Design a protein around this ligand. Structure first.
Ligand SMILES: [Cu+2]
Ligand SMILES: [Cu+2]
Ligand SMILES: [Cu+2]
Ligand SMILES: [Cu+2]
Ligand SMILES: [Cu+2]
Ligand SMILES: [Cu+2]
Ligand SMILES: [Cu+2]
Ligand SMILES: [Cu+2]
Ligand SMILES: [Cu+2]
Ligand SMILES: [Cu+2]
Ligand SMILES: [Cu+2]
Ligand SMILES: [Cu+2]
Ligand SMILES: [Cu+2]
Ligand SMILES: [Cu+2]
Ligand SMILES: [Cu+2]
Ligand SMILES: [Cu+2]
Ligand SMILES: [Cu+2]
Ligand SMILES: [Cu+2]
Ligand SMILES: [Cu+2]
Ligand SMILES: [Cu+2]
Ligand SMILES: [Cu+2]
Ligand SMILES: [Cu+2]
Ligand SMILES: [Cu+2]
Ligand SMILES: [Cu+2]
Ligand SMILES: [Cu+2]
Ligand SMILES: [Cu+2]
Ligand SMILES: [Cu+2]
Lengths: 295, 295, 295
């Protein structure tokens, strides 16, 4: 895109604030940002806030979101679709023009680990170019296993294709499949979907801990066979809804846009790979590491 | 196929009648019918009754089906496999020759949303060319959420490939992925698997309604990540069996041949896309619309 | 691989023995063995024990496994990852050099139907070349439906690609997708993943029986839509964990590495195909048969 040549918009922090017991303001950008998706490979991503996947959003069950999108893209319209919410797509997930802002309000009444993404046609193009993310809605009554959890992280799986190539997006295999982590607490890593960062800078944990991962596979196109090497999931909640409770899974199948909360124990010191078990995708980037130490 | 050149057999209505408290007659055709699968694109489909997917069948749990296939195809044998039933495949899902009929009887003792299809080798060829459909078996005791449902429709996802091309069927990506709707009550739409009809003529509903969809992904080859934009599934029953109850799903993964009953609330007026969230497939046709109005 | 030219190591039996109430020794080989994967097609597989998938392992919930791998491969290192166990991957699933042995100990505390495989980088290469299998962990308290089961077998789904071709492994469609069966009791068949053996020599059962299948789809890359023609699954336990209980499924979606215990009744004499319902994969080999007789 001629108006994107040379564009590299610095990442802008997510802006959130609570404005009532059940009401939260969120402000995001749509912006054009170079991201190194594999060593030596820059993708001029279409993004929320200069991250791909975008920044993590966390709300409480029952919160109404008053969402603003500020479109920094000089030429392409963008929009926002939160899978968490009940909304009229043709009124509430509509386009914001270049250099404009739009505000939309809708309720998050369901707990879970939801995808968000740009909803502008062609949606495949906007997703594939980077405009995806996760919103977590915390359940009012928690999860039954909350008390057993020692540590938690968020992981997101995505694919990358040939740059802005719709033929490839629709017909081709992914060039890369990747994990990213988005921070829940200070100190947590916050990374973009790339083939290497979570190998070089593993997630951390201690021996004996029960680890919770909030996970979502945002696609655009593939399903995920999510697995932690050297463990078994003690408990899984599909889509992060507490009622959708499975036990003792080795591998959790996630549809495109599918989420889960998974929990597992790391019993020994060492480094534990985290994969999609579709190993063509793992080979093409989708392996993260978890480094478990006596500390 | 030389004997299919110029063949375009007019659609024939499904014939059903109840013949006892637990016994139902069904008569279908196998026939060769031109269907416009995308604008300007005619596929000379292999079909049940001149529809692809075929006509909807609905029975009650515990019904024995006395099924007749009348094969109108001038040269290819065809057969019928109902996933609802318990049957001997090598006696009961056998071939009917051109210009002949066959009658087979078997019981539907399980509730749910089942695929049916032609079972003639190579099965991939017969499925891919159009010979798939849905049979709904209504549970004797209903679903626990029946009383909350305001309106219902049936949707079916399928793919289309390069015409009668086995190499493509086995090795290629789909050319189109599509939704169709099949009528449960008078007035409901009844459409074929195409890229456009359910965009141009959305399904209808009113503001505030809880909508039930009976869905099946008949393939032949892909899995589906079924999602309604602007809502969350309140309740999902996998395969339509009442016991397989999930809550609060954003997206339901369906295997090839997989079914579900899903229920969701539309809270605001507007048009709500219905997709598979594998967006390469959505781009290639698999988006239907639901138009929600104050009436 | 130059050092694999002309290598065809005769299959070696799995060695197992119990050494305490909760402790079991297992000894396997890594070895290079020609397997006929389709008629006329030899694949010089990388294997455990000269089988691909490898030999079946069955332990009890709560058993600690003291596992030895004897690497017979003249030039490539190999390793073992059991999805059943809790282990440190970087200490316990490490490489064994050519012509060496390694011993690793870890506990199987979760019931189910778990994949095992070689864990040597690149893992895709080692899996794709044949180094996969199943370990069954029997639940201490059984399954609630145990008393209804008349007969049982183990099936495994895998793919085969172009020989040792990483480009194909990562980017190409499978050349074959296959089922194998691994023996639970004397007399049961024990076969390799090929396109034909379970067609020519169907699994056997009697009319009226309830059949349990322990199934795993080891991939490397595809998901499976597992279905038995002419029946419906009465009961399904995802990953073989008794708590993950579904009823009345027509088709069970399995992720890559995903397992299940499925149970179904065969009501009439005849031959019942067993498929993945992704029919491109079925066409490419993944159909087994079950022959049901009055005896
Ligand atoms: Cu309040
Ligand atoms: Cu506000
Ligand atoms: Cu956009
Ligand atoms: Cu979406
Ligand atoms: Cu792919
Ligand atoms: Cu702890
Ligand atoms: Cu593992
Ligand atoms: Cu574990
Ligand atoms: Cu539970
Ligand atoms: Cu009666
Ligand atoms: Cu009759
Ligand atoms: Cu046919
Ligand atoms: Cu079928
Ligand atoms: Cu495909
Ligand atoms: Cu209502
Ligand atoms: Cu949505
Ligand atoms: Cu909803
Ligand atoms: Cu329930
Ligand atoms: Cu004991
Ligand atoms: Cu020992
Ligand atoms: Cu190996
Ligand atoms: Cu594994
Ligand atoms: Cu494939
Ligand atoms: Cu019996
Ligand atoms: Cu069937
Ligand atoms: Cu059955
Ligand atoms: Cu149950």
């Amino acid at each position: 895109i001629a108006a994107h040549k040379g564009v590299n918009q610095a990442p802008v922090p997510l802006k959130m604030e609570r404005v009532g017991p059940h009401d939260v303001h969120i402000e995001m950008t749509a912006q054009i940002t170079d991201i190194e998706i594999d060593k030596g490979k820059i993708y001029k991503a279409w993004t929320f806030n200069g991250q791909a996947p975008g920044p993590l959003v966390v709300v409480n069950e029952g919160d109404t979101i008053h969402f603003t999108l500020k479109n920094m893209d000089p030429v392409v319209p963008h929009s926002m679709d939160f899978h968490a919410v009940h909304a009229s797509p043709s009124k509430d997930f509509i386009d914001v023009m270049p250099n404009k802002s739009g505000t939309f309000t809708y309720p998050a009444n369901k707990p879970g680990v939801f995808m968000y993404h740009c909803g502008t046609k062609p949606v495949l193009q906007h997703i594939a170019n980077g405009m995806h993310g996760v919103i977590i809605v915390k359940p009012k009554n928690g999860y039954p296993t909350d008390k057993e959890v020692d540590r938690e992280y968020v992981l997101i799986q995505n694919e990358w294709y040939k740059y802005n190539d719709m033929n490839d997006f629709q017909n081709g295999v992914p060039s890369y499949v990747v994990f990213s982590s988005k921070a829940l607490k200070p100190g947590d890593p916050n990374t973009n979907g790339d083939t290497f960062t979570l190998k070089e800078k593993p997630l951390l944990a201690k021996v004996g801990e029960k680890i919770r991962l909030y996970i979502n596979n945002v696609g655009p196109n593939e399903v995920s066979s999510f697995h932690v090497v050297g463990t078994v999931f003690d408990d899984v909640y599909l889509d992060g809804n507490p009622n959708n409770h499975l036990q003792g899974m080795q591998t959790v199948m996630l549809p495109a846009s599918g989420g889960a909360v998974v929990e597992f124990t790391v019993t020994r010191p060492g480094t534990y790979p985290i994969v999609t078990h579709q190993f063509n995708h793992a080979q093409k980037g989708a392996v993260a590491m978890l480094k478990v130490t006596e500390t």
